[PDB]
Enzyme design. Structure first.
Site, PDB file in Angstrom:
ATOM      1  N   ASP A 245      -2.566-103.940  93.024  1.00 19.26           N
ATOM      2  CA  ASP A 245      -1.328-103.562  94.066  1.00 19.26           C
ATOM      3  C   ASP A 245      -1.461-102.022  94.395  1.00 19.26           C
ATOM      4  O   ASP A 245      -0.520-101.435  95.272  1.00 19.26           O
ATOM      5  CB  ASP A 245       0.163-104.034  93.687  1.00 19.26           C
ATOM      6  CG  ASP A 245       0.863-103.163  92.712  1.00 19.26           C
ATOM      7  OD1 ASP A 245       0.081-102.294  92.021  1.00 19.26           O
ATOM      8  OD2 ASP A 245       1.952-103.144  92.527  1.00 19.26           O
TER       9      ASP A 245
ATOM     10  N   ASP B 153       1.408 -96.782  86.682  1.00 17.02           N
ATOM     11  CA  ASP B 153       2.583 -96.497  85.659  1.00 17.02           C
ATOM     12  C   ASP B 153       2.418 -95.371  84.772  1.00 17.02           C
ATOM     13  O   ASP B 153       1.311 -95.109  84.442  1.00 17.02           O
ATOM     14  CB  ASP B 153       2.564 -97.933  84.588  1.00 17.02           C
ATOM     15  CG  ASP B 153       2.596 -99.288  85.269  1.00 17.02           C
ATOM     16  OD1 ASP B 153       3.201 -99.611  86.023  1.00 17.02           O
ATOM     17  OD2 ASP B 153       1.621-100.149  84.814  1.00 17.02           O
TER      18      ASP B 153
ATOM     19  N   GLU C 241       4.829-100.723  75.624  1.00 15.01           N
ATOM     20  CA  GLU C 241       4.182 -99.974  77.076  1.00 15.01           C
ATOM     21  C   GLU C 241       3.233 -98.954  76.950  1.00 15.01           C
ATOM     22  O   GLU C 241       2.147 -99.062  77.582  1.00 15.01           O
ATOM     23  CB  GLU C 241       5.450 -99.719  77.995  1.00 15.01           C
ATOM     24  CG  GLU C 241       6.281-100.773  78.480  1.00 15.01           C
ATOM     25  CD  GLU C 241       5.724-101.833  79.378  1.00 15.01           C
ATOM     26  OE1 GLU C 241       4.686-101.371  79.941  1.00 15.01           O
ATOM     27  OE2 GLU C 241       6.139-102.511  79.725  1.00 15.01           O
TER      28      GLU C 241
ATOM     29  N   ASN D 259      -3.221-100.163  88.345  1.00 19.22           N
ATOM     30  CA  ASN D 259      -2.859-101.528  88.537  1.00 19.22           C
ATOM     31  C   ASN D 259      -3.784-101.605  90.051  1.00 19.22           C
ATOM     32  O   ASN D 259      -3.357-101.526  90.926  1.00 19.22           O
ATOM     33  CB  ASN D 259      -1.261-102.104  88.784  1.00 19.22           C
ATOM     34  CG  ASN D 259      -0.476-101.448  87.759  1.00 19.22           C
ATOM     35  OD1 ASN D 259      -0.834-101.860  86.199  1.00 19.22           O
ATOM     36  ND2 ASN D 259       0.440-100.593  87.642  1.00 19.22           N
TER      37      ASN D 259
ATOM     38  N   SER E 270      -0.669 -99.556  92.524  1.00 24.52           N
ATOM     39  CA  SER E 270       0.241 -98.564  91.992  1.00 24.52           C
ATOM     40  C   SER E 270      -0.008 -98.236  90.495  1.00 24.52           C
ATOM     41  O   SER E 270      -1.162 -98.713  89.998  1.00 24.52           O
ATOM     42  CB  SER E 270       1.511 -99.641  91.891  1.00 24.52           C
ATOM     43  OG  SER E 270       1.574-100.641  90.968  1.00 24.52           O
TER      44      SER E 270
ATOM     45  N   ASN F 284       6.617 -97.423  87.016  1.00 25.59           N
ATOM     46  CA  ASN F 284       5.815 -97.832  88.193  1.00 25.59           C
ATOM     47  C   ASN F 284       6.106 -96.935  89.506  1.00 25.59           C
ATOM     48  O   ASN F 284       7.204 -96.600  89.862  1.00 25.59           O
ATOM     49  CB  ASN F 284       5.717 -99.123  88.461  1.00 25.59           C
ATOM     50  CG  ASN F 284       4.746 -99.753  89.364  1.00 25.59           C
ATOM     51  OD1 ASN F 284       4.912 -99.844  90.435  1.00 25.59           O
ATOM     52  ND2 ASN F 284       3.386 -99.997  88.834  1.00 25.59           N
TER      53      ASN F 284
END
Length: 130
Positions: free
Chosen positions: A49, A53, A35, A46, A51, A60
């Site tokens: 969408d 992380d 990650e 991202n 959003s 998220n």
């Protein structure tokens, strides 16, 4: 901060991650490696969408922390997403623990399925004294 492998291993143990909701420490290690590369300040937008992380576990903003600019979001961990970018992972760990409390568990993170599931993950904790 960028953690060294064994240093993070010992930290997550102390924080009670080993076997949390049936997840072995090597699994959490596998997750943070893929990650964020063990980087606490990592962020990933991202575009898809809208959003973001945040942190070592790349939590998220749509469901777990509040960043204010994510449409239709919830803040299940009750944290400012900002809280997950400090050098300390006490907050990341308390939130990750919350994520795995949902039916999906660790599967919530696709990288876990691509990179860690059904693999020999012992390498992540070998020689760390955990």
């Amino acid at each position: 901060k960028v953690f060294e492998r064994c240093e993070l291993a010992r930290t997550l143990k102390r924080l009670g991650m080993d076997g949390y909701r049936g997840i072995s420490l090597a699994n959490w290690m596998c997750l943070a490696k893929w990650e964020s590369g063990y980087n606490t300040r990592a962020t990933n937008y991202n575009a898809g969408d809208r959003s973001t992380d945040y942190g070592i576990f790349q939590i998220n903003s749509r469901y777990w922390c509040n960043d204010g600019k994510t449409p239709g979001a919830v803040n299940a961990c009750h944290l400012s997403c900002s809280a997950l970018l400090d050098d300390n992972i006490a907050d990341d760990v308390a939130c990750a623990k919350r994520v795995v409390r949902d039916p999906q568990g660790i599967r919530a993170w696709v990288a876990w399925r691509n990179r860690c599931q059904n693999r020999d993950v012992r390498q992540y904790v070998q020689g760390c004294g955990v």
